[PDB]
Write an enzyme that holds these catalytic residues in place. Structure first.
Site, PDB file in Angstrom:
ATOM      1  CB  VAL A 461      -0.950   0.011   1.212  1.00  0.00           C
ATOM      2  CG1 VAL A 461      -1.861   1.229   1.208  1.00  0.00           C
ATOM      3  CG2 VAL A 461      -1.773  -1.261   1.287  1.00  0.00           C
ATOM      4  CG  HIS A 462       3.705   3.785  -2.930  1.00  0.00           C
ATOM      5  ND1 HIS A 462       4.773   3.848  -2.060  1.00  0.00           N
ATOM      6  CD2 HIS A 462       3.969   4.663  -3.920  1.00  0.00           C
ATOM      7  CE1 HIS A 462       5.642   4.734  -2.498  1.00  0.00           C
ATOM      8  NE2 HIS A 462       5.173   5.248  -3.641  1.00  0.00           N
TER       9      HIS A 462
END
Ligand SMILES: Cc1cc2nc3c(=O)[nH]c(=O)nc-3n(C[C@H](O)[C@H](O)[C@H](O)COP(=O)(O)OP(=O)(O)OC[C@H]3O[C@@H](n4cnc5c(N)ncnc54)[C@H](O)[C@@H]3O)c2cc1C
Ligand SMILES: C[n+]1nn(-c2ccc(-c3nc(CCc4ccccc4)cs3)c(OCCN3CCNC3=O)c2)cc1CCCCN
EC number: 1.8.1.12
Length: 489
Positions: A461-462
């Protein structure tokens, strides 16, 4: 059939006690008496209805840590364009304590509504002690010659009286405070000494650091080489550095020998090294021991060991078959969710008919230091003893926001301890903002027997600090047969 006034008498309306009392009363329709020494938080008793975490533990501690964090967040807002007069900006401690008192009070009130409105669940105010296996006596004071208020005839007894701060036991020990008194201080001290190196000493150092008046300072004095015994070594060294940069003076291999009272009301402190120093307050966070010493446990014949800890089996049962003990009074892990779990398991076992023992392994916890720690499972030290071959994965990075904020000391650190044989994750150790939130989810994975391959096969998850969990493929180093090796045989 009715033999007795109650099915269950609970000594201590804390994390464990209320879980047990409530579950036994509503889901099993049992008749439950719950004993505690006062209904509202405050000295000299300090603990009250709701227990240590609600009144003088993790609830009020977390509120004050949140409060202290604004010092860092206000400093950091400058980089992002927030211009305000930061000249001699220090917070109002009375405002914080008022707000915290209002919150804790509303929880105490909420628990009174529970008792008044819950059928077969009653609250008995005063000091619990045993007469025999089926009789608990409630007195006005701790003193065993004090007037008896109630005699509770009961089938089962649950002991959930928690723990109490240890004292230093030196000349001038009585001029020092603990966590208990720290919560009701009239003023934020200018010159603060926190004695100890456990999660309480470190959390309170960060609170006093946040709320110190304009020329003020906090010293943290520990008798050992490195604070936070039992935590990841590299996490402990990096936090020591980050407290330093936040303005806390950490002093190792130091113990006070003598405190004496100054003319102005301050404390003169003598130390090992010969050094003398003056502090407005001196706080002791050097241990918490079971509260078993006023329960007349010998009279009923309940086995006491350790530092007065009550001995139990996996089912939290004492030497007497109808008497059980849970939470900090039994030693084990002194955490609120553990006590709640033992309390729940006690009711399932005795009244539910469906026996269960609380699982004490792979329990995640947090230290609400600034910055905070989130940990679950074993250190590489205890892994390398109990395991044939151990892989250590390690990653330190600086969130890009700290290029702007000015807070370049705020390294985020992850350390994964694995069994090299099967890849099983034995330990996860994190230091940095949101670590306590991230570790909860890590605790679920580790319960399910997560392997290192389960972490790095997960899409990230960026941008987050947590995505670094899923980008650790190559071990930093190993242990084979309890000895550190650069590379694997
Ligand atoms: C400053 C501080 C911060 C903490 N922070 C955290 C945290 O962030 N996370 C976490 O998981 N844990 C935390 N803890 C630990 C947590 O508070 C305890 O593990 C937990 O409260 C234990 O619950 P218990 O039911 O065993 O006992 P307690 O909750 O302590 O219940 C004891 C109750 O019984 C009463 N009592 C005592 N003796 C008698 C008697 N003779 N008769 C009748 N009543 C009696 C007491 O007044 C009290 O109300 C913290 C502790 C402290 C001190
Ligand atoms: C009308 N009535 N109100 N209550 C009641 C009241 C309070 C609570 C609780 N309050 C708290 C504090 C939360 C709080 C949060 C923010 C501000 C203030 C308080 C935790 S649990 C509460 O929660 C019970 C769940 N608990 C309590 C201890 N362990 C539990 O699992 C229930 C019960 C009843 C009747 C039950 C049916 C049998 N006749």
């Amino acid at each position: 059939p009715m033999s007795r006034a109650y099915d269950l008498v609970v000594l201590g309306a804390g994390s464990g006690g209320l879980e047990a009392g409530w579950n036994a009363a509503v889901t099993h329709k049992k008749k439950v008496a719950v004993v505690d020494v006062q209904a509202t938080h405050g000295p000299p008793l300090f603990a009250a209805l709701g227990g240590t975490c609600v009144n003088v533990g993790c609830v009020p501690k977390k509120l004050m840590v949140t409060g202290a964090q604004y010092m860092d967040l206000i400093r950091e807002s400058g980089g992002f364009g927030w211009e305000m007069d930061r000249e001699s900006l220090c917070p109002n401690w009375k405002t914080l304590i008022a707000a915290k008192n209002k919150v804790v009070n509303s929880i105490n009130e909420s628990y009174k509504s529970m008792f008044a409105d819950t059928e077969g669940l009653s609250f008995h105010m005063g000091f619990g002690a045993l007469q025999d296996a089926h009789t608990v006596v409630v007195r006005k004071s701790e003193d065993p010659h004090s007037d008896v208020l109630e005699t509770l005839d009961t089938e089962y007894i649950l002991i959930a009286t928690g723990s109490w701060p240890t004292r230093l036991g030196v000349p001038g020990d009585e001029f020092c405070i603990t966590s208990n008194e720290a919560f009701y201080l009239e003023d934020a001290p200018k010159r603060m000494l926190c004695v100890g190196g456990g999660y309480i000493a470190v959390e309170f150092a960060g609170i006093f650091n946040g709320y110190k008046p304009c020329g003020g300072y906090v010293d943290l004095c520990y008798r050992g080489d490195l604070i936070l015994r039992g935590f990841d070594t590299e996490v402990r060294k990096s936090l020591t550095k980050q407290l330093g940069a936040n303005g806390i003076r950490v002093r190792t291999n130091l113990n006070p020998t003598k405190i004496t009272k100054n003319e102005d009301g301050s404390n003169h402190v003598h130390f090992n090294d010969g050094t003398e120093e003056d502090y407005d307050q001196v706080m002791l966070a050097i241990g918490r021991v079971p509260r078993s010493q006023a329960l007349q446990l010998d009279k009923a014949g309940v086995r006491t060991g350790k530092n007065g800890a009550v001995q139990v089996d996996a089912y939290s049962k004492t030497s007497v078959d109808n008497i059980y003990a849970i939470g900090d009074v039994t030693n084990r892990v002194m955490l609120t969710p553990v006590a709640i779990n033992e309390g729940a398991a006690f009711v399932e076992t005795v009244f539910g008919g469906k026996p269960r023992a609380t699982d004490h392994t792979k329990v995640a916890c947090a230290v609400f230091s600034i910055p905070p720690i989130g940990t679950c499972g074993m250190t590489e030290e205890e892994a390398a003893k109990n395991y044939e071959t151990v892989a250590v994965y390690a990653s330190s990075f600086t969130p890009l926001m700290h290029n702007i904020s000015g807070s370049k000391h705020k390294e985020f650190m992850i350390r994964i301890i694995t069994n090299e044989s099967n890849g099983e994750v034995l330990g996860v150790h994190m230091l940095g903002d949101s670590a306590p939130e991230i570790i909860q989810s890590v605790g679920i994975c580790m319960k399910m027997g997560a392997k290192i391959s389960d972490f790095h096969s997960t899409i990230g998850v960026h941008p987050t600090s947590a995505e670094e969990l899923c980008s650790m493929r190559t071990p930093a180093y190993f242990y084979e047969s309890g000895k550190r090796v650069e590379k694997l045989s």
